[PDB]
Amino acid sequence: TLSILVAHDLQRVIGFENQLPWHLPNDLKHVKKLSTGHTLVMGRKTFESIGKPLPNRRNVVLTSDTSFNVEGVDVIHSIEDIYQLPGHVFIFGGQTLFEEMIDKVDDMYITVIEGKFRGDTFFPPYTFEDWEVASSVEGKLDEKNTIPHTFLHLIRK
Ligand SMILES: NC(=O)c1ccc[n+]([C@@H]2O[C@H](COP(=O)([O-])OP(=O)(O)OC[C@H]3O[C@@H](n4cnc5c(N)ncnc54)[C@H](OP(=O)(O)O)[C@@H]3O)[C@@H](O)[C@H]2O)c1
Numbered sequence: 114t115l116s117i118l119v120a121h122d123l124q125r126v127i128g129f130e131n132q133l134p135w136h137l138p139n140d141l142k143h144v145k146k147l148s149t150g151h152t153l154v155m156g157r158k159t160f161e162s163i164g165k166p167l168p169n170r171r172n173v174v175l176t177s178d179t180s181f182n183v184e185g186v187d188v189i190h191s192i193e194d195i196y197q198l199p200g201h202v203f204i205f206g207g208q209t210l211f212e213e214m215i216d217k218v219d220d221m222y223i224t225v226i227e228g229k230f231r232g233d234t235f236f237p238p239y240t241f242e243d244w245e246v247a248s249s250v251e252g253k254l255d256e257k258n259t260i261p262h263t264f265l266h267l268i269r270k
């Protein structure tokens with residue numbers, strides 16, 4: 114299975130100045146639950162933003178930099194390499210990876226952040242004409258999670 118994993122706001126903002134624009138611990142728990150024991154593929158900027166691989170999954174970084182050889186990370190240099198990765202592979206960002214992969218993936222796990230943030234990077238437009246809502250789950254709000262959000266699993270029709 115090849116899936117997208119993304120959090121985007123009401124206007125599809127995903128990032129600002131190489132960080133996520135919001136603080137939402139519940140989304141990180143969601144990412145942990147979905148991708149633990151599987152594979153994340155991410156662009157170089159996304160990797161540099163987190164600074165080290167996420168524990169307990171295969172971390173794969175797509176970059177043209179042939180000097181990239183980082184402990185605990187596998188490197189790939191072509192989109193085509195993604196198709197050779199075994200098991201459940203999640204396309205993890207950022208904007209450039211999402212744009213390159215949205216027409217190729219089987220499904221998408223989207224956290225819709227129900228607010229409008231300042232962004233400099235975006236998820237590409239998509240239409241529910243093309244995507245079946247396999248599930249839609251409102252996230253719970255509390256002291257540590259104060260922005261409304263919804264977890265959508267979309268499957269290509
Ligand atoms: N909200 C979310 O779900 C989410 C998730 C992830 C990231 N983000 C945000 O997304 C933003 C970063 O997105 P971005 O588009 O600027 O960067 P990115 O997608 O993370 O990384 C872009 C880099 O990936 C490499 N790359 C992409 N396609 C390639 C290809 N076909 N061949 C070789 N290398 C390729 C290139 O690295 P080289 O230049 O080294 O060749 C390119 O400069 C940040 O703000 C981050 O916080 C948001």
Ligand SMILES: CC(=O)c1cccc(-c2cc3nc(N)nc(N)c3cc2C)c1
Nearest residue numbers: 118119120133140141144163205206224
């Ligand atoms: C430290 C850590 O796990 C962390 C910190 C800030 C942001 C993110 C982060 C959260 C994310 N959430 C979702 N739904 N999807 C992604 N593709 C994603 C990607 C990254 C990089 C992760």
